[PDB]
C-alpha cells in the first residue's frame, strides 16, 4: 500500500486481533446484568473506528455503538463538539473506546464531559497507551498495548488522514512528516 | 448467545459476509488502480455501515481514506448532523452503504455529494433489497441481493440493538411490534 | 394585525420591552466596565431578537456567540466557535421556566473555565424559584401562562411579534 | 463612544438603516401577500438584520438559522436547518454580498430541497457582486468596495454590536 513510508512494524495484525480477543473477554466478564440495558461503547471519530468495530465483536455481551465528533479550538484539552451523542447516556453503562492515549488531554476532556451526563458507570478502553499517558488523572481500566513514544500509523491511526486503513501498526518514516 | 429468542434465522453467515467483502475489495481495488496522486475516499453515513466500511477498507488493496457523515430525518429529505471533515472536490469518492431499500437516502446522498464536484462518484452497498434493484442511482458494487426481510446484524439495527452481530439475521416480528 | 384572533391579551408591549432592555444594557454596561470584550452567549432561537437588541443597548463592547441544542439534558447541535477560557461571559436567555436548560448551559460553560459567568433572561416564570442557578439580570417576572412573541414561539410561529402576549386557547 | 478612534467615518447611520429596513419589509410584505414566509440566515453577520427585518415585514415570518465554516466556493455545514423547507416560500437573508460565492453555495443548497419559491434579500451589496450570477430580489444599499464594520459586520469578531455601519481606520489592521 505505502512503499517507503513505513519504517518498521510495531504491532502485527495478528498481535492486534489477539489482544482485542482478550480485551473482549475481560470486558465481557466485568460487565456480565441487573440493568437490562446493553453496554454502551462510545467512540470519538475517527481513529478508534477500526478498533471499536473489532472490539465490539470480541465482547461476548450485547453492545451498542455511539459516536462523537470533535475538533480542537487550539491547545483536559479544550475541545469543540462537532457531533454530539445520538442518545442520552443517563443511567447507562458506558465504555469509552480510544485508539491511543498520549498527553491524556482528549480523554480528560471526554471523561468530564460524559461524567456530567450522569451515566451509571464510566470506564475507559484504549488500544494504545504512550509513556506520557501512564500515570494520568483519568483511570483506564483496559489497555491493549503499552507502546513507546514513537509516531505510529495504521489500524485507524493517521498522518494527514492517510495510513488509517493498514491492518497493522507501524512506525512512520520521519521523511513523511518532516 | 448474544440475543437468544430474538433472531428467527440466519440470512448470511459471517464467513459468507467476509468472503464477499474480499471479492468486493479486489474488484474495487482493480477499478481504482486505473495518476492523480490522491487516495480513494470512502464515505460512510453513520452508523450502520461502520462495521462494513472498516472491513471493506482493509480488503481494498489500494490506499483508502475515511470520511463520515451523520444525518437525520426531518424525494429523500435529509438533515445533516455532521458534514464531511474535508472538501471532496476533485477527489475519487466511493459511497459505502450498509443497505439500500427504498433508495431514498442514497438519492439524497448522491446528489448532495455530486454538487461538491468530485472527480468521480461510485456507490458500494453490502445489502440491496428488491425495491432498490431498479433505483435511479447506479450502484457499481453490490455485496448481496437479499429479500425484503427486516434484517439485523453487522451494523444493521433495530432500536440501536444487534449492530454488533458478526452475521446478518432475520429478526423475530415479536421484537419490533 | 399579523395573527388575528390568536393573541388573547398583550403582556408586554414593544415600548415596555425596549425600555427595559435599555435599562438592562445600562446596568450591565456599568457592571462590566473593566482587555477582551464582553461575550454574550445565546441559545437559538428564542433569545435571538432579545440578544440583538440587548447587545446594542450595552455601552461596552460586546461579542456574539450562538449555541444550538436539542432535547434527547440536551444534545449539542452547534457548539461555540471559540475557546471561552479566560473570557467574561454573559448567558442571554429568553425565558427561564423550569430552569433546567439554564442549569445544563451553566454547567457546560463553567467547565470551559471562563473568568466570569453571569445570566440574563428577558422573562422569568414562577417555576424558576425552584431552580438553583443565580440570575444577575431579569427583564420581567411573569405568571405561568404560555406566552408568545419577541422570539418566543408556539410551533415556530409568533417569534416575529414585536410584543409579547398570551396565546388564545383556540390555537392549541 | 463604543470603540473610540477605531471608526474613521460613518457610512450608514442607525436611523438610515432602520428606515431602509422599514421600506424593505413593506416591499417584501406586499410581494408575499397558507404557510408562513421563511427567513433563512447564515450565522452570524446577518442576525441583527434578520431580527429587525422580520419585525418590519407586515406578514407572518419564521426564522431558520444555518451555521457553516470554510473547508480549510463550497462550505461545511455545522448547523443545518431545523425543518424541511419543502414547498415553503423562502427568503435568504444576507448581510453583504461581495464576491457572491457564499450566496452562490447557499442558493444551490436550498434549491435542492425544493422550496415553493426562493428569493434573496441582502442589506448590503458591493461592486464585485456584478459577476456573481445569482439574482437578488431585495437590496438595502449598494456600497463601495471599502471594508466596513458594524450592524453584524465584524473585523475579527469585533464591532458587530454597532448600531450603524462604519469604516475602520487602517490603524486597526
Ligand atoms: O502515534 C501517534 N499517531 C497518530 N496520532 C497520535 C499519535 N500519538 C498521539 N496522537 C494523536 C492523538 N491525540 C489527538 C487526537 N485527535 C486530535 C487532533 P487535533 O484536533 O487536530 O489536535 C485526532 C482525531 P483522529 O482520530 O480523526 O485523527 C489524542 C491523544 P491525547 O494527546 O489527547 O492523549
Ligand atoms: O432490514 C433492515 N434492517 C435495518 N434497517 C433497515 C432495513 N431495511 C431498511 N432499513 C433502514 C435503512 N435506512 C437507512 C437510514 N436509517 C438510519 C441509519 P442507521 O444509523 O445506520 O440505523 C434511517 C433514517 P431515519 O430512521 O431517521 O428515517 C434507509 C435505507 P433507504 O430505504 O433510504 O434505501
Ligand atoms: O410561555 C412560554 N412561551 C414559549 N416557550 C415557553 C414558555 N414557557 C416555557 N417555555 C419553554 C422554554 N424552554 C426553552 C427550551 N427549548 C426547548 C424546547 P423543546 O425541544 O420542545 O423541549 C426551546 C427552543 P427555542 O428557543 O427554539 O423555542 C425551556 C426553558 P426552561 O423550562 O428550561 O427554563
Ligand atoms: O465590508 C465588509 N465587512 C465585513 N465583511 C466583509 C466585508 N466585505 C466582505 N466581507 C466578507 C463577507 N463574507 C461572508 C462570509 N463569511 C466569511 C468567512 P472568512 O473566510 O473566515 O472570513 C462570514 C461569516 P460571519 O457572518 O459569521 O462573519 C463573504 C461574502 P461573499 O464574498 O461570499 O459575497
Ligand atoms: Mg482518539
Ligand atoms: Mg490524527
Ligand atoms: Mg445506511
Ligand atoms: Mg436504523
Ligand atoms: Mg431559551
Ligand atoms: Mg419553543
Ligand atoms: Mg453573510
Ligand atoms: Mg468576518
Automatic annotation (TrEMBL), chain C:
Keyword Cell membrane: no
Gene3D superfamilies: 3.40.50.2020
Locations listed in the record: Cytoplasm
Cofactor(s) needed: Mg(2+)
UniProt cross-references to Pfam families, sorted A to Z: Pribosyltran
Pathway info: Purine metabolism; IMP biosynthesis via salvage pathway; IMP from hypoxanthine: step 1/1; Purine metabolism; GMP biosynthesis via salvage pathway; GMP from guanine: step 1/1
Phosphoribosyltransferase domain location: 18-154
CDD domains per UniProt: PRTases_typeI
Superkingdom as given in the UniProt entry: Bacteria
Keywords, comma-separated and alphabetical: Cytoplasm, Glycosyltransferase, Magnesium, Metal-binding, Nucleotide-binding, Purine salvage, Transferase
Gene Ontology MF term list: guanine phosphoribosyltransferase activity; hypoxanthine phosphoribosyltransferase activity; magnesium ion binding; nucleotide binding
Catalytic activity field: GMP + diphosphate = guanine + 5-phospho-alpha-D-ribose 1-diphosphate; IMP + diphosphate = hypoxanthine + 5-phospho-alpha-D-ribose 1-diphosphate
EC number(s) reported in the record: 2.4.2.8
GO cellular component terms, semicolon-separated: cytosol
Coiled-coil intervals: none
One of the protein's GO biological processes: purine ribonucleoside salvage
Record flagged with keyword Lyase: no
Assigned protein family: Belongs to the purine/pyrimidine phosphoribosyltransferase family.
NCBIfam families: HGPRTase
Record-given protein name: Hypoxanthine phosphoribosyltransferase
Source organism of this protein record: Mycobacterium tuberculosis (strain ATCC 25177 / H37Ra)
